[PDB]
mmCIF file of C-alpha atoms and ligand atoms in Angstrom:
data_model
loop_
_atom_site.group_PDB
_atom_site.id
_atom_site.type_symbol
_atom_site.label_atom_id
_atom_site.label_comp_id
_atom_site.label_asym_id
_atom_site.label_seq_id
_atom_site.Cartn_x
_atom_site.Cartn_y
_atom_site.Cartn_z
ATOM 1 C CA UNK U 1 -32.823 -18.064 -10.893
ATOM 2 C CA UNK U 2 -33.643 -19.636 -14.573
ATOM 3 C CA UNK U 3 -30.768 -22.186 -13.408
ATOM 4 C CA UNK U 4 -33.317 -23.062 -10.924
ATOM 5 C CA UNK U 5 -36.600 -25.350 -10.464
ATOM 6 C CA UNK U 6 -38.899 -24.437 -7.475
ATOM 7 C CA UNK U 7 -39.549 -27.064 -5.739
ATOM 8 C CA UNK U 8 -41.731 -25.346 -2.850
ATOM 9 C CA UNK U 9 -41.847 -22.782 -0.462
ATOM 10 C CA UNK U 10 -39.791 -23.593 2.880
ATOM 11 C CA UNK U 11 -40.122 -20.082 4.444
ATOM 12 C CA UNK U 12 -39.563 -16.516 4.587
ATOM 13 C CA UNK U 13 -36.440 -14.944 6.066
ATOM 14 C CA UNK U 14 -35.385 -11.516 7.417
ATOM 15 C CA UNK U 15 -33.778 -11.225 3.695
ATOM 16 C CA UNK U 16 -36.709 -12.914 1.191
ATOM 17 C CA UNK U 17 -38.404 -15.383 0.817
ATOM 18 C CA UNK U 18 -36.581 -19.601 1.204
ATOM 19 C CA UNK U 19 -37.438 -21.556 -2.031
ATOM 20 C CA UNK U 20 -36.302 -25.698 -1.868
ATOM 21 C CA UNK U 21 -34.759 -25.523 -5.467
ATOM 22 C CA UNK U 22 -33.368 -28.329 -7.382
ATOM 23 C CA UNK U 23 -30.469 -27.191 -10.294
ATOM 24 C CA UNK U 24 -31.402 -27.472 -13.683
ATOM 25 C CA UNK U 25 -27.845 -28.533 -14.839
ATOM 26 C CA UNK U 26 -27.033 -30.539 -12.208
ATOM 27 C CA UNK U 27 -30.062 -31.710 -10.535
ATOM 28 C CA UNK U 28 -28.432 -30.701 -6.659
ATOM 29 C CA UNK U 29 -31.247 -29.711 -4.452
ATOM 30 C CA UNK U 30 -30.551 -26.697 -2.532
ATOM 31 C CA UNK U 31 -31.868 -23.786 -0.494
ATOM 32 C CA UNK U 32 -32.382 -21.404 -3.109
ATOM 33 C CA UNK U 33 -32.570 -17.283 -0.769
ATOM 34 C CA UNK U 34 -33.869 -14.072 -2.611
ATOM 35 C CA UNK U 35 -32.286 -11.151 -1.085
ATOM 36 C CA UNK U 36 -34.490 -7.874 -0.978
ATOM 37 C CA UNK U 37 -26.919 -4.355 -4.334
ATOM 38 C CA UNK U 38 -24.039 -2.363 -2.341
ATOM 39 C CA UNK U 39 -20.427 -3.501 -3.092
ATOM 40 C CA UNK U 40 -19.841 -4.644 0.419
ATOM 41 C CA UNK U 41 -22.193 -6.703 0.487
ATOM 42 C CA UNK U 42 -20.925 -8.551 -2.388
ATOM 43 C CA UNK U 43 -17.415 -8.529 -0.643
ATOM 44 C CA UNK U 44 -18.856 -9.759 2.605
ATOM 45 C CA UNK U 45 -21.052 -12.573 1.193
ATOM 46 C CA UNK U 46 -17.887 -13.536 -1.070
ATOM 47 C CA UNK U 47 -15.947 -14.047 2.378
ATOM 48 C CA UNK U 48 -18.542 -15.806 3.588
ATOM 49 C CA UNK U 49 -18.015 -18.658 0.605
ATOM 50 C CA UNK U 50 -14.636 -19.563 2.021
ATOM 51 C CA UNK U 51 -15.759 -19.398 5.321
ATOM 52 C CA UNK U 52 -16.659 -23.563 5.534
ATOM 53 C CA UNK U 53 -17.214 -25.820 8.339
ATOM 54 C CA UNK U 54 -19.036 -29.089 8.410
ATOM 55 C CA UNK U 55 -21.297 -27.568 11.723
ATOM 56 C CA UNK U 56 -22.069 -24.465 9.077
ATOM 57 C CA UNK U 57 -24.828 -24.702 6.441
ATOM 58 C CA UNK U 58 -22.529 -24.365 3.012
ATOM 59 C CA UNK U 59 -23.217 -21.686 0.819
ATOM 60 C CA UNK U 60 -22.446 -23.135 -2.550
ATOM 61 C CA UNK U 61 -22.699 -20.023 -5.016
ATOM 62 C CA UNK U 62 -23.666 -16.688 -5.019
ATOM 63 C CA UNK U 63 -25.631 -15.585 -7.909
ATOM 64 C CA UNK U 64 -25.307 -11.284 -8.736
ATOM 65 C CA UNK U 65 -27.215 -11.090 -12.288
ATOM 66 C CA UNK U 66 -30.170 -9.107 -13.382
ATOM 67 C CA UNK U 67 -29.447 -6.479 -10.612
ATOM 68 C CA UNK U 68 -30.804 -9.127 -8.216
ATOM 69 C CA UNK U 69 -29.692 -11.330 -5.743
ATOM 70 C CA UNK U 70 -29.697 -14.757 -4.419
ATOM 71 C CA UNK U 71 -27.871 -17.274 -2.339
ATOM 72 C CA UNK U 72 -27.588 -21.052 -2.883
ATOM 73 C CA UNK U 73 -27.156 -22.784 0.427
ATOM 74 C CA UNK U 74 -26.952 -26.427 1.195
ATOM 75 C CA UNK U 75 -30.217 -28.225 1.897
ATOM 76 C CA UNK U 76 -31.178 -29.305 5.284
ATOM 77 C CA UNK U 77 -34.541 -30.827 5.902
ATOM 78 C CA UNK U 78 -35.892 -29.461 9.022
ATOM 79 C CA UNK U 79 -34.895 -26.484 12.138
ATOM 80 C CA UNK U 80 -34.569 -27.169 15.641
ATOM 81 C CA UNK U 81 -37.570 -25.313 15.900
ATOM 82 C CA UNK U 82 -40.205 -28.170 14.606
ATOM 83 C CA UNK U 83 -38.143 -30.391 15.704
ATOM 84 C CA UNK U 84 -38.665 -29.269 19.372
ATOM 85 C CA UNK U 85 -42.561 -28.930 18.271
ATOM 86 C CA UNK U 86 -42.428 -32.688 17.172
ATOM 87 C CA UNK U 87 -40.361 -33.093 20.713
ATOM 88 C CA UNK U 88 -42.763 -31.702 23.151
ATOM 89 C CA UNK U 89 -44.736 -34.558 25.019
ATOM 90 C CA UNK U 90 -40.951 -36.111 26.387
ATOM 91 C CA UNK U 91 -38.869 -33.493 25.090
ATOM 92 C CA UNK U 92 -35.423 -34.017 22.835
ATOM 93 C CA UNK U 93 -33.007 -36.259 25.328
ATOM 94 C CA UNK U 94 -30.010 -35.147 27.104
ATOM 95 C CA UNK U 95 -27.216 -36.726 24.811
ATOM 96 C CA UNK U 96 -29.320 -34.904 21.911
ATOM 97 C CA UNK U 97 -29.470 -32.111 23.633
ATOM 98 C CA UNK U 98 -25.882 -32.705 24.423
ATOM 99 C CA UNK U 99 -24.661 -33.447 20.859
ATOM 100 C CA UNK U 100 -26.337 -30.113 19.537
ATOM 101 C CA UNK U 101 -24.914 -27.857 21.976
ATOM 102 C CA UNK U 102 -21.387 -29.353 21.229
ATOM 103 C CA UNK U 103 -21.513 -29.107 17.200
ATOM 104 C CA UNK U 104 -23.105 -26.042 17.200
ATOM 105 C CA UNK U 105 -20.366 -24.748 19.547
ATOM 106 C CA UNK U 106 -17.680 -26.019 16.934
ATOM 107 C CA UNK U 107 -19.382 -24.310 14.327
ATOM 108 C CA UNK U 108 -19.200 -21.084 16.406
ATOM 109 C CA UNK U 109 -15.726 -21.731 17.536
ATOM 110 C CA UNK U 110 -14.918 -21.607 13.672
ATOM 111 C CA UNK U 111 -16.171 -18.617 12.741
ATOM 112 C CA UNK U 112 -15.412 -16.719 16.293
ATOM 113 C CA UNK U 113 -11.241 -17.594 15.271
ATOM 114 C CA UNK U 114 -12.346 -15.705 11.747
ATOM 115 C CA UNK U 115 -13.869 -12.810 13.525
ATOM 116 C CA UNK U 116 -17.431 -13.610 12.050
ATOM 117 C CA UNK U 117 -20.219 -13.637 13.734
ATOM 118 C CA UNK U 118 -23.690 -14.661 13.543
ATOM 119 C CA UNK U 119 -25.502 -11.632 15.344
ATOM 120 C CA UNK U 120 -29.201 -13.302 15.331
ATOM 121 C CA UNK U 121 -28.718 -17.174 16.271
ATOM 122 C CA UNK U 122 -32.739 -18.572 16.964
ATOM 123 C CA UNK U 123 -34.093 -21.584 16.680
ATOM 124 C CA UNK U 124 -35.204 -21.571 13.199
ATOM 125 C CA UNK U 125 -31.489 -21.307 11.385
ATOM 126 C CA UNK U 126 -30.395 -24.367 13.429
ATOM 127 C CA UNK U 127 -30.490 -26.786 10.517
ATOM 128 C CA UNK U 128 -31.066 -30.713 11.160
ATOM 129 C CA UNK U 129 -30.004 -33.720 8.933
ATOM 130 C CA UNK U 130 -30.685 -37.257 9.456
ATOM 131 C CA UNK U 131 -26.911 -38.345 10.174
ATOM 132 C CA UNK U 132 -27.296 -36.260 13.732
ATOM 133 C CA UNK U 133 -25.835 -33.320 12.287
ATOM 134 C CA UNK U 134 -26.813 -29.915 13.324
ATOM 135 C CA UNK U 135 -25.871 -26.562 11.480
ATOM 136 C CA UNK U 136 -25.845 -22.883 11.794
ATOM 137 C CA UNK U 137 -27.940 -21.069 8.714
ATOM 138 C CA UNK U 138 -27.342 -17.173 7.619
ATOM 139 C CA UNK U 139 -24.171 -17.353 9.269
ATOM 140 C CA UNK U 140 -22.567 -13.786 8.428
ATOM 141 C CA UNK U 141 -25.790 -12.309 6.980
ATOM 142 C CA UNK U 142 -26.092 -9.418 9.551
ATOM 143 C CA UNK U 143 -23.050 -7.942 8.620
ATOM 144 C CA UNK U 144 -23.534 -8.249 5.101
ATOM 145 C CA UNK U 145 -27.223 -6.769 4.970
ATOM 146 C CA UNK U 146 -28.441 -5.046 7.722
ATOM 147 C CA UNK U 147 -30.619 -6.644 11.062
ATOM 148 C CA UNK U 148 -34.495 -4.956 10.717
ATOM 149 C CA UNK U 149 -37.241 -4.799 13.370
ATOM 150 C CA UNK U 150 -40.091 -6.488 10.894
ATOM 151 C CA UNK U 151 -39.482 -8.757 7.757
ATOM 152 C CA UNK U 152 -40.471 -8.112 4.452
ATOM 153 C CA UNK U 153 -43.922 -9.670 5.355
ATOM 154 C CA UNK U 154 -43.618 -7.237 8.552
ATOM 155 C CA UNK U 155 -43.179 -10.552 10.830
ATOM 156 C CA UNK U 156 -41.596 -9.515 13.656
ATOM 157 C CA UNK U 157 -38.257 -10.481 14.193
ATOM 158 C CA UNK U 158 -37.650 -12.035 17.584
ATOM 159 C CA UNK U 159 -35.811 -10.889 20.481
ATOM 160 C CA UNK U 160 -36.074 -13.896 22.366
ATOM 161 C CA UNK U 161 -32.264 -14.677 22.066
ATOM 162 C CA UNK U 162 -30.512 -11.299 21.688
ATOM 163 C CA UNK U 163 -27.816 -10.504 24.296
ATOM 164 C CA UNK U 164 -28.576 -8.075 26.969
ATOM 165 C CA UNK U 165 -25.646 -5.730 25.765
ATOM 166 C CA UNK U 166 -27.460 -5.234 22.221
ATOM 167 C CA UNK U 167 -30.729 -4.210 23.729
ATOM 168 C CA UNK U 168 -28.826 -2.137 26.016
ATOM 169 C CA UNK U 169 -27.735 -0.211 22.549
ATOM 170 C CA UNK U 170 -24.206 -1.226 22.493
ATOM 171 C CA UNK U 171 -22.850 -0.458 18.727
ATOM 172 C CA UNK U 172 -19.915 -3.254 18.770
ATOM 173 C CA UNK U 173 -20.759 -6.296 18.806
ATOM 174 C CA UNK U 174 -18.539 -9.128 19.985
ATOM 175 C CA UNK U 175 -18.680 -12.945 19.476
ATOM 176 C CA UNK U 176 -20.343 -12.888 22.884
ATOM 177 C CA UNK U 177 -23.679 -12.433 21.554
ATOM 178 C CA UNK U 178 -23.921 -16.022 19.905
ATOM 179 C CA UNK U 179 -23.284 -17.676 23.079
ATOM 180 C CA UNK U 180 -25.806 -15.740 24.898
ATOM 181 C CA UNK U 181 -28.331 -16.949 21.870
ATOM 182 C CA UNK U 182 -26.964 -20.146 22.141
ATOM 183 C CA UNK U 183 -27.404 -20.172 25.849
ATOM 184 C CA UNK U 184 -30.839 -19.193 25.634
ATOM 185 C CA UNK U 185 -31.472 -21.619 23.327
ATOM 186 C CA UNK U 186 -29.475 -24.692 25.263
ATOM 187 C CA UNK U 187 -31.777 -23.150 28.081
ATOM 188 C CA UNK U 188 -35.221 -23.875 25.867
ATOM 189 C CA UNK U 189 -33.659 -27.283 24.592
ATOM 190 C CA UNK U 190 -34.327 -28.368 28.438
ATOM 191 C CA UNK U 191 -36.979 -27.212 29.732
ATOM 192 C CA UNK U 192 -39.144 -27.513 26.640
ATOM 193 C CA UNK U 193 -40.132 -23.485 26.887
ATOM 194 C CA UNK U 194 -38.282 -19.911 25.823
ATOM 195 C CA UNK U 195 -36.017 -18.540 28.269
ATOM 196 C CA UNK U 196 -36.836 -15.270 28.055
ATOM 197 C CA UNK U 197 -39.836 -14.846 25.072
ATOM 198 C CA UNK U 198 -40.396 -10.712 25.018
ATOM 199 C CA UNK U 199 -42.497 -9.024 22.899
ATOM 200 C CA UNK U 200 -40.669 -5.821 23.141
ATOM 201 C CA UNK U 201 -37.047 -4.646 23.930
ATOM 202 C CA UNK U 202 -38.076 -3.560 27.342
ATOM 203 C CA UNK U 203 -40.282 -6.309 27.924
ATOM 204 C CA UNK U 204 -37.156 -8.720 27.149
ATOM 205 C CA UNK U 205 -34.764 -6.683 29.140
ATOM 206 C CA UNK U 206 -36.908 -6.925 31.672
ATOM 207 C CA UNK U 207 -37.454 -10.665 31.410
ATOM 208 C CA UNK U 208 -33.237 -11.236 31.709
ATOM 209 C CA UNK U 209 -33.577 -8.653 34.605
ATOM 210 C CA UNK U 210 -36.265 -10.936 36.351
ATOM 211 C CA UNK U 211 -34.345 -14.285 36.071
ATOM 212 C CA UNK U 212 -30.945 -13.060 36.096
ATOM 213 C CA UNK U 213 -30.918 -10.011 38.844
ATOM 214 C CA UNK U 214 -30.522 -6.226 37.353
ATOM 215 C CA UNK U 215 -27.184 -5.987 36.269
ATOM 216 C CA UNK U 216 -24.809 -3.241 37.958
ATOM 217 C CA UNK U 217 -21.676 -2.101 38.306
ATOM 218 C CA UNK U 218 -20.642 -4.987 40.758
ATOM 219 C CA UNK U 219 -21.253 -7.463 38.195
ATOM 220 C CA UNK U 220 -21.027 -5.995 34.667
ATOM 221 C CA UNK U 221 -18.386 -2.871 34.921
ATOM 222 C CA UNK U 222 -19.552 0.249 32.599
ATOM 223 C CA UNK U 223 -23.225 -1.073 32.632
ATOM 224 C CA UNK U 224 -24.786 2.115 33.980
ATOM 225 C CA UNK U 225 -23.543 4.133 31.279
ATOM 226 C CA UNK U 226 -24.366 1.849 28.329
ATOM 227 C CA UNK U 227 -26.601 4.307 25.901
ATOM 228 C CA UNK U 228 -29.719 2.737 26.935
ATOM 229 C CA UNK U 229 -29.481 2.427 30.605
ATOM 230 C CA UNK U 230 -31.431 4.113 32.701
ATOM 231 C CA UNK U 231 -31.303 4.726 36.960
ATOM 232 C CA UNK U 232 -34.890 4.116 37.116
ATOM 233 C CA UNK U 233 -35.070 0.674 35.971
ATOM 234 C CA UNK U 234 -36.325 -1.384 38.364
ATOM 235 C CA UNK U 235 -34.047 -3.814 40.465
ATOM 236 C CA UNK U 236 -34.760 -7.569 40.558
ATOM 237 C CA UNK U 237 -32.942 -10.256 42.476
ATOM 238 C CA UNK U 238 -31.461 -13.144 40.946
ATOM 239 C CA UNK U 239 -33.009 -16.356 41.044
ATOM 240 C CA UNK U 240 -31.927 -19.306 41.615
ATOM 241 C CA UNK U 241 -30.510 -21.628 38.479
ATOM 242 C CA UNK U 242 -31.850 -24.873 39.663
ATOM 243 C CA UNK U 243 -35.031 -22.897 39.987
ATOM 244 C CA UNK U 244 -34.233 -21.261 36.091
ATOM 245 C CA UNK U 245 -33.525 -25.022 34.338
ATOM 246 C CA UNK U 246 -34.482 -27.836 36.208
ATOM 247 C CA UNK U 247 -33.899 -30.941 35.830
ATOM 248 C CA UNK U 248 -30.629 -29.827 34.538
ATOM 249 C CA UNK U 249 -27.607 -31.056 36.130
ATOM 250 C CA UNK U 250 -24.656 -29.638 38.067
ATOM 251 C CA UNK U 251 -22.470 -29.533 34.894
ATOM 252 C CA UNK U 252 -25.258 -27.836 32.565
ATOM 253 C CA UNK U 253 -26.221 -25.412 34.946
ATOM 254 C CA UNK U 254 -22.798 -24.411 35.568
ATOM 255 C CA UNK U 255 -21.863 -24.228 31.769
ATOM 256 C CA UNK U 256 -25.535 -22.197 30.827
ATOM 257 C CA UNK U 257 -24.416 -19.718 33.852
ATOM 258 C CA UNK U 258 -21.201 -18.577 31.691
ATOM 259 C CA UNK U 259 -22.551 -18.683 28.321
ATOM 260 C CA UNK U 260 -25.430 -16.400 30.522
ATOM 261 C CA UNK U 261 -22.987 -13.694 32.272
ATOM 262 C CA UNK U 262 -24.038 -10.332 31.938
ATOM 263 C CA UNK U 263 -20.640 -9.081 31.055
ATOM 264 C CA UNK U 264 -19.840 -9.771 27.478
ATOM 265 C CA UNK U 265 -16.121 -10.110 28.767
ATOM 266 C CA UNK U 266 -16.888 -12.867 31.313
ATOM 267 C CA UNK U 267 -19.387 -14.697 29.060
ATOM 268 C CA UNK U 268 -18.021 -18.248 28.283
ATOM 269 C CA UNK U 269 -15.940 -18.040 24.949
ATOM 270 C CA UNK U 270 -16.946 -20.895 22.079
ATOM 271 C CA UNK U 271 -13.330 -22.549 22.637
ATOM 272 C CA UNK U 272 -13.248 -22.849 26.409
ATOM 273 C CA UNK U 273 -17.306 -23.963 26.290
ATOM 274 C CA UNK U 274 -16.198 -26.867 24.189
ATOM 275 C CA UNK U 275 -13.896 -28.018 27.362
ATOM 276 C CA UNK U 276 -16.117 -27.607 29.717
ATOM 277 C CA UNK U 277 -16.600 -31.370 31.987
ATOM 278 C CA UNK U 278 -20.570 -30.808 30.648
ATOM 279 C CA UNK U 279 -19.011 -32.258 27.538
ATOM 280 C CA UNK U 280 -17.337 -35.013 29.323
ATOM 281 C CA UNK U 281 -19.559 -38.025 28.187
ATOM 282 C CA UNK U 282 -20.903 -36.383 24.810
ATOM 283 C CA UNK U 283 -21.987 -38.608 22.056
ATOM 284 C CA UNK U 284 -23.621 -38.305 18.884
ATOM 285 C CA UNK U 285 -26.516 -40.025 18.658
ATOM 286 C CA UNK U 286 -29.076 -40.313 15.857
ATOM 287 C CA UNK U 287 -32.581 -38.682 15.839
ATOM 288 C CA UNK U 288 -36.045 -39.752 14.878
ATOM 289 C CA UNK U 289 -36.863 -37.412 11.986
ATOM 290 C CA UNK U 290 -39.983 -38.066 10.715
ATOM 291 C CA UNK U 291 -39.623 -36.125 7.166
HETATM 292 N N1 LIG B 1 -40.121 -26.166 8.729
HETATM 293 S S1 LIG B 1 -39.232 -27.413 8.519
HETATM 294 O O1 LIG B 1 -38.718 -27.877 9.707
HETATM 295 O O2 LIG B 1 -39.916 -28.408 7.843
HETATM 296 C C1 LIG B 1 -37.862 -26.940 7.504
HETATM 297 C C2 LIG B 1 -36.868 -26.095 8.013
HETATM 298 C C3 LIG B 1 -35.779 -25.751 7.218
HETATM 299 C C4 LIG B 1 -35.695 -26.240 5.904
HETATM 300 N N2 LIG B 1 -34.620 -25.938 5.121
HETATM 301 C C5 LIG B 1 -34.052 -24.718 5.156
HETATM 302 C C6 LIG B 1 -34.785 -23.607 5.550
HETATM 303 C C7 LIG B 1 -34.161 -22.374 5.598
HETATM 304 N N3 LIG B 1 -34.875 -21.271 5.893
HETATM 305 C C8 LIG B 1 -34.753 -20.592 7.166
HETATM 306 C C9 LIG B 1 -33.338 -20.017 7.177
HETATM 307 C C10 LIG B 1 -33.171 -19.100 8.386
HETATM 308 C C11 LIG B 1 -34.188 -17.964 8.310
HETATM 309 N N4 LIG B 1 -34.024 -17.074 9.471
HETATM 310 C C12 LIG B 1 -35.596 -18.544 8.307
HETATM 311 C C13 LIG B 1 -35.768 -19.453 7.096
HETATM 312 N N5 LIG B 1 -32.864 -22.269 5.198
HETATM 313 C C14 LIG B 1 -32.200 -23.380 4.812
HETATM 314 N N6 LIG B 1 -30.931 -23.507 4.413
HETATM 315 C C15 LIG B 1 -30.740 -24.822 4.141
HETATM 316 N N7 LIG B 1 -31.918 -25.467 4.385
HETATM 317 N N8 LIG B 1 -32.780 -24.562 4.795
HETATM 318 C C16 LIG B 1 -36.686 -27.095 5.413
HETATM 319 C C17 LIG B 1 -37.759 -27.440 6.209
#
């Protein structure tokens, strides 16, 4: 930490609280994370350090002293989040859009062939740089800590972008779940609003079960006896996907539908995503970030 100059505050997490930091020594600037330690943990995060990919926010050490611990990422300057925020009046253009999708996709790819996932994928750990990069943040974190309902400032966490099978209490998670999130998020990239923003687990089921028809056994084998189903939920019709993301074209739409399957099996993978014809014409072109 002493190694370490505050710069300023640039958040809280699920973890601690996000410090800008600049190194004493060697005068990097970094992301400087407190984490609120267990063995695994250590052996997780130290997996993690290896685990590098130029669509994956670098984590350059990991500090264990003084009982207490703390992560040095890479610095990135803004999320996708304020980014969006700063987007709103046109919203971010389809090559952007495009571009995002794609790298963020490679990054998953990545990780997916190492068995690591990110479990909690939103908005705000999709990093930005000036060059046109974007990058996944807390990649692996989940697994290492432990996913809570409120943060250590008792923010809620969001379920905006959790996958239908998680809500639905599954235990085992698959790589399916960042899609999903990433879907949802492609999905908010577009039409400039949250896909499905719930303020409660039922509320969000409930939300997917609106837009996307109540899944059954037709469509997602071994749904009814997932540990949180339940007969009496009530059964919606699917809508309509030119309806869901308009103006989105024929090659989005059909790419968001697989990365949107209710069946974790089905659900686009990272790899085959990447080859999709939406990625035909992609490009990677430069944003204006006002910093
Ligand atoms: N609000 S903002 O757009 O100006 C902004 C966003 C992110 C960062 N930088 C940043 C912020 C950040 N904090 C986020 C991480 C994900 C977590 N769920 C929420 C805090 N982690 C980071 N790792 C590397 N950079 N970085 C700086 C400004």
């Amino acid at each position: 930490m002493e190694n370490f100059q505050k710069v300023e505050k640039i958040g809280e997490g699920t973890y601690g609280v996000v410090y800008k930091a600049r190194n004493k020594l060697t005068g990097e600037v970094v992301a400087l994370k407190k984490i609120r330690v267990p063995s695994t943990a250590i052996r997780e995060i130290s997996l993690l350090k290896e685990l590098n990919h130029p669509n994956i926010v670098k984590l350059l050490d990991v500090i264990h002293t003084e009982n207490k611990l703390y992560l040095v990422f890479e610095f990135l300057h803004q999320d996708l989040k304020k980014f969006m925020d700063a987007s709103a009046l046109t919203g971010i253009p389809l090559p952007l859009i495009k571009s995002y999708l794609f790298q963020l996709l490679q990054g998953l790819a990545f990780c997916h062939s190492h068995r690591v996932l990110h479990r909690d994928l939103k908005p705000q750990n999709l990093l930005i740089n000036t060059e046109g990069a974007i990058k996944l943040a807390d990649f692996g974190l989940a697994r290492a800590f432990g996913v809570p309902v409120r943060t250590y400032t008792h923010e809620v966490v969001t379920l905006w972008y959790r996958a239908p099978e998680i809500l639905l209490g599954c235990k085992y998670y698959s790589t399916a779940v960042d899609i999903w999130s990433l879907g949802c998020i492609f999905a908010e990239m577009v039409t400039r609003r949250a896909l499905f923003p719930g303020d409660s687990e039922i509320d969000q089921l409930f939300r997917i079960f609106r837009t996307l028809g109540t899944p059954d056994e037709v469509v997602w084998p071994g749904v009814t006896s997932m540990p949180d189903y339940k007969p009496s939920f009530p059964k919606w019709a699917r809508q309509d996907f030119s309806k869901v993301v308009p103006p989105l074209d024929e090659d989005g739409r059909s790419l968001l539908s697989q990365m949107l399957h209710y069946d974790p099996n089905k659900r686009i993978s990272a790899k085959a995503a990447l080859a999709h014809p939406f990625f035909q014409d992609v490009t990677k072109p430069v944003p204006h970030l006002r910093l």
